[PDB]
DNA sequence: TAGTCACATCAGTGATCAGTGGTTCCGGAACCACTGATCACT
C-alpha cells in the first residue's frame, strides 16, 4: 500500500477549539484509545477535523456515516481538501432492492429483485482498487461494509499489471481479463469491457472511468495509452497500469473449486436439515437454485446469488466475520464513524 | 408495530423492427408494312 502523503489544502485558518481538539485527539489516538468520543457541536466541521487527523495519522481511513444520503455531500468536499490523494466511494449500489424474502405464513417467495445503479458499483472497486494499490486511501461506507465480500487477497491476487515494452502474450492477456471479469465486447465499447481489433486492445476498466489503449508488437506489450472511452482522446501515455477485477466476488479458478466443494458439502447439510425439518418443498427449491447455480459457476464462475456462498468462497468458517471492506483495509488502517 | 435493511434474472411478452417472402402493374392502338383476288391480257 503506497501511501502518497495527505496533501491538504485548506485556505481556511483554525481558530477557536479546532486547534486544542485536533491535538488532544491526535494524542489520544498516540494514546492507543481504542475506543474515543468527540462532542462536535453545530457547525463545528467535524470533516476538517477528521481530513487533518487522516494527514497526521497517513493511514488508511474508512469512515461510517448511516445513510448514503450524508455521505454524498461530504467526500466531494473533502476532495477539495484532498487533491492528490485516493479519496472514494461505498455505498449500497442499488436504486432499488427487494432482498430475497419469504412470508413464511402464505408461502411466498419475495424474490431477490434490483435495480442497479452503476456509479455506486463503480466507485465501490475503485475503493477496493485503492486500498489494495495505496495506502493513502479514504473511504466512506454504509454499514453494507460489513456485509460478506470476497478476500481483498484474491483482490490483489486476480489483478495483473502490464507495462510498455514488456513481452507478454496478448491471447494470455484477453484470458486474464476474463478470469478478472471483463468482456470481450467486440461490437461496442462500456464499462468493465473490452474490444480486440488486430493487435489493438481497448478496454473500459470496472472502476476506472476512463479507457485504454494498448498496442502490441506480435505478442509483446507495444504500447499503452489512456483514452476516453468512446470518442478515444487520448489523455496522456504510461509505461505500465495495473488492472483489478471488475468483481469483488474476486477468486481464483482454485477458490472457485474450494467454494464449489464447500457449498456442495453445505449443500448436503441443508438438504438434511430441512428434510428432518419437514419442509421438503422448501428444501428442493433451494437444492435446485443451487443446483443451477452451481452449474453455472462450472461453466462461468458468475450468477445471482454468489454472496450466499461467501464462507465457502472466503472459505472461512460459518458464524465466522464473513470478508470485508475492513479487511481491504489494513490493521494500522484509521477508523472514523 | 415499524424504517432500513441490500448481496439480478429465468421467463414471458410482445413491440418493433427488420429481415425475408412476394407485386404487380399498366398502356394497346398503332406500328412495321406484308399478302390472296380481278380483272386484264393472252
Redesign the pocket.
Given at each position: 500500500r503506497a501511501g502518497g502523503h495527505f496533501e491538504v489544502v485548506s485556505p481556511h485558518a483554525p481558530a477557536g477549539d479546532q486547534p486544542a481538539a485536533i491535538d488532544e485527539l491526535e494524542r489520544r489516538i498516540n494514546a492507543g484509545e481504542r475506543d474515543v468520543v468527540l462532542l462536535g457541536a453545530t457547525g463545528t466541521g467535524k470533516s476538517a477535523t477528521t481530513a487533518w487527523l487522516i494527514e497526521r495519522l497517513q493511514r488508511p481511513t474508512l469512515v461510517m456515516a448511516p445513510?448514503?444520503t450524508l455521505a454524498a455531500q461530504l467526500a466531494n468536499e473533502l476532495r477539495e481538501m484532498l487533491p492528490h490523494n485516493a479519496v472514494e466511494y461505498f455505498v449500497?449500489?442499488?436504486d432499488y432492492?427487494q432482498?430475497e424474502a419469504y412470508i413464511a405464513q402464505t408461502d411466498t417467495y419475495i424474490?431477490?429483485?434490483?435495480?442497479?445503479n452503476d456509479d455506486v458499483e463503480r466507485l465501490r472497486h475503485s475503493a477496493t482498487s485503492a486500498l489494495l494499490s495505496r495506502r493513502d486511501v479514504v473511504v466512506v461506507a454504509?454499514?453494507?461494509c460489513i456485509?460478506g465480500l470476497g478476500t481483498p487477497q484474491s483482490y490483489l491476487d486476480r489483478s495483473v499489471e502490464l507495462k510498455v515494452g514488456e513481452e507478454v502474450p496478448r491471447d494470455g492477456l484477453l484470458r486474464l481479463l476474463v478470469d478478472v471479469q471483463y468482456t470481450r465486447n467486440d461490437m461496442s465499447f462500456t464499462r468493465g469491457s473490452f474490444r480486440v481489433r488486430g493487435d489493438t486492445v481497448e478496454i473500459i476498466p470496472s472502476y476506472e472511468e476512463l479507457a485504454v489503449r494498448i498496442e502490441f508488437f506480435g505478442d509483446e506489450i507495444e504500447a499503452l495509452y489512456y483514452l476516453h472511452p468512446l470518442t478515444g482522446e487520448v489523455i496522456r501515455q504510461v509505461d505500465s497500469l495495473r488492472i483489478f477485477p471488475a468483481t469483488h466476488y474476486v477468486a481464483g479458478p482454485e477458490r472457485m473449486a474450494h467454494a464449489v466443494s464447500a457449498i456442495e458439502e453445505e449443500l448436503a447439510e441443508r438438504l438434511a436439515e430441512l428434510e428432518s425439518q419437514g419442509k421438503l418443498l422448501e428444501a428442493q427449491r433451494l437444492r435446485m437454485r443451487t443446483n443451477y447455480d452451481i452449474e453455472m459457476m462450472r461453466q462461468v464462475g458468475?450468477?445471482?446469488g454468489?454472496?450466499n456462498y461467501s464462507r465457502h468462497i472466503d472459505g472461512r468458517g460459518p458464524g465466522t466475520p464473513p470478508a470485508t471492506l475492513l479487511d481491504y483495509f489494513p490493521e494500522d488502517f484509521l477508523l472514523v464513524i
Open positions: 445513510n448514503k449500497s449500489y442499488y432492492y432482498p424474490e431477490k429483485d434490483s435495480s442497479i454504509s454499514v453494507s456485509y458468475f450468477c445471482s454468489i454472496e
